[PDB]
Amino acid sequence: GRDIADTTDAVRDPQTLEILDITPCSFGGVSVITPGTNTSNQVAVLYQGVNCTEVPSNVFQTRAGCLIGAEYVNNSYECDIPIGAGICASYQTSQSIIAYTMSLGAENSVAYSNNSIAI
Amino acid sequence: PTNFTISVTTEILPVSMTKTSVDCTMYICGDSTECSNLLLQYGSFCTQLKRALTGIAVEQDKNTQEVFAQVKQIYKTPPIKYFGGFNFSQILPDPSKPSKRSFIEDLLFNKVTLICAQKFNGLTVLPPLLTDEMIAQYTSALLAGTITSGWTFGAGAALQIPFAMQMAYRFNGIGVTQNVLYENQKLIANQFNSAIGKIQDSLSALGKLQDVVNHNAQALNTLVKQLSSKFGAISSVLNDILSRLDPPEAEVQIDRLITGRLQSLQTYVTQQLIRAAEIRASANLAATKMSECVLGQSKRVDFCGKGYHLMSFPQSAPHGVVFLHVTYVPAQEKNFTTAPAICHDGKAHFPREGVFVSNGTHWFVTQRNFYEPQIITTDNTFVSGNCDVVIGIVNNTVYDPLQP
Amino acid sequence: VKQLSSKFGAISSVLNDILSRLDPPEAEVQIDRLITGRLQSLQTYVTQQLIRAAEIRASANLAATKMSECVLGQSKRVDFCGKGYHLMSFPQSAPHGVVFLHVTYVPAQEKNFTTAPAICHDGKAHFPREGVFVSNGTHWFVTQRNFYEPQIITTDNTFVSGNCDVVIGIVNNTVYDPLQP
Ligand SMILES: *[C@@H]1O[C@H](CO)[C@@H](O)[C@H](O)[C@H]1NC(C)=O
Ligand SMILES: *[C@@H]1O[C@H](CO)[C@@H](O)[C@H](O)[C@H]1NC(C)=O
Ligand SMILES: *[C@@H]1O[C@H](CO)[C@@H](O)[C@H](O)[C@H]1NC(C)=O
């Protein structure tokens, strides 16, 4: 059996005579998040596009793969180390590596009225 | 001209481009230690392509920031939604969606669009740093600042203003007096509403982003399909070579496959560099167009549309940006008799802000883009010289507004 | 420089260790490999140098345009010669580049006011020539757009077009005629 990429996708067993699909084993990229050698020595490891139930220190499942070694907070700060899909890493408590969603700015509402100007 | 037609056009420019990261060691060999040893004596060829593609990805992340991240604060619109009679409901986003994108956006993200086969050979597509929700929030903040402020929020703090006099200032910026807006406000609002309602039927062009997507998919499809080439070797798969020959006699076919796949990857890297140079030029043009048309009014001809430019509105698109250029197109022309100067009491008179026209019997001053005749008066005329030097100068009475 | 110490499938990396040890007509299959590898390295170097030269020619053209516009004049293009309302730019020479010192105008310290599009006086509307219509609570003034300077309502900075039945939001106020006798 062959797919559109002209490689082996399926096979037939010679004894039992049934078809068995062939799937490649899991693989991805390893990115190391470092706050700085002169600052500290503890790092974080980001796996690129790999589910967290395959990798053999807080586990986080993100759209940019599985992140190991960073703690999610529910606040929002500006981006320091961009990870991907709206998640940034930093170094605060300067004790541990934290992860968060980036903040695009403040929250401002211009006071529109029918008769109002500011000069 | 005696009348105008407010027209909303549509311009599409690509901004971003699909990031790819290629593991050059596994693309060529995959699991062969002998092929990995044979690749070691080729220098730093497998590192320069990785560095180049990393630069491509960082540049593609940088291209979005200059276009969309031009606001210090995320702006909001008060929920009354009455901007002088102008309808922005199709343009402003709705709260009844998880992504909070407008209709006009939702017609664009649906049009722009082999599964997992490229994953096995070592080709990974990195996600963008900014998701679609944050780009939509940036576009909504820019658009709300444009509605509530004008050009003031791009040069510092955001100063509040009514929309019906922001439109009067943008009318004054193209040479038309501001009484035209205050006396044809409902006509201009209805023309804008019809012109923005026709956009959905106009778009439902967008082939530039589709061409970008198709090129970036076809390059990866060719890179996958080039693995079947033998390049003079007896096989295209390394496991068939390694299970048949001793490494005394198997260092020729693997070498041929290595020189085939190295030149298959290097040309892909160079064409990606050239294509991202074009994408970076398009992103620079889009950032300049956003800064000059959205955060202000531009006097450059045919830069922010076709006509006398009033304002523009950004709309987010997949790997691009869409501008809605609002312009001033005149219509319903007439014919008049004109003169360069008026001779009265032996001295020439020239208009300080208008033209000299006649309908056949009487002479008046109008503007240059709109027909509004008025009585000849010393207030809109200045005196320079006598009626001897100018040619084509006609005689007419000039009224001074001082009776006693 | 570092690519000269590669093998490219040969048995050595320098020519003198092959031309003095290996056979004369059996070293032609490895000298060719070294020639092919070094030619490919030099061709790739020239290829990336051309693209970098184009990407720096674009920035040189951009720098020439802003030296023509911001330094040799005043530009009305938004965010081209700084961030704000542009006043000047001063060139400074730099290694392999140029540094511009963009002098811009940034306002501050705003106050809120009540606004009207026109003034209905004596049954006819009045519009400002180059100003606004603001009020601080009781009386109406004409200031500039970018600087608060309240001035007395006068015929000399207003023009009349039609009556006050077409404009919406128009308020009623007096207009001073600067003619006492
Ligand atoms: C794979 O990731 C998804 C996240 O979308 C989630 O279902 C889970 O973590 C993984 N799937 C399974 C079946 O474990
Ligand atoms: C402005 O006036 C209109 C009158 O039709 C009204 O509907 C609208 O609510 C007013 N705006 C605000 C912010 O109250
Ligand atoms: C256009 O305006 C009308 C009247 O105010 C109202 O239906 C709504 O605000 C808009 N309709 C649209 C966008 O379909």
Residue numbers in the entry:
A (entry chain B): 566 to 621, 640 to 676, 689 to 714
B (entry chain C): 715 to 827, 849 to 939, 944 to 1143
C (entry chain B): 963 to 1143
Copy text from the publication.
Two-dimensional (2D) classification of particles from cryo-EM data revealed a particle population that closely resembled the prefusion conformation of WT S. The structure revealed that prefusion S(P2) in a 1-RBD-up conformation accounted for the majority (70%) of the high-resolution particles, contrasting with the WT S(P2) all-RBD-down (79.6%) conformation. The diminished resolution of the RBD-up conformation, as compared to the other parts of the S structure, suggests a conformational flexibility and dynamic equilibrium between RBD ‘up’ and RBD ‘down’ states that is consistent with other reports of SARS-CoV-2 Omicron S structures. This resolved structure of XBB.1.5 S(P2), therefore, closely resembles the more open form and flexibility of the S protein of earlier Omicron sublineages. C The overall structure of Omicron XBB.1.5 S(P2) trimer modeled based on the 2.98 Å density map. The XBB.1.5 S(P2) had a melting temperature (Tm) of 63.0 ± 0.2 °C, approximately 4 °C lower than the Tm of the WT S(P2) (n = 3). However, several new glycosylation sites were also identified in XBB.1.5 S(P2), including N164, N536, N824, N856, N907 and N1119. However, the RBD in Omicron XBB.1.5 S(P2) conforms to a more open and flexible state that contrasts with the closed state of the ancestral strain and early Omicron lineages.
Biophysical characterization of Omicron XBB.1.5 S(P2) demonstrated that it maintains a prefusion conformation and adopts a flexible, predominantly open, state, with high affinity for the human ACE-2 receptor. The findings reported here demonstrate that the monovalent Omicron XBB.1.5-adapted BNT162b2 vaccine encodes a prefusion stabilized S(P2) protein that tightly binds the ACE-2 receptor, maintains a relatively open and flexible conformation, and confers optimal immune responses against contemporaneous SARS-CoV-2 strains.
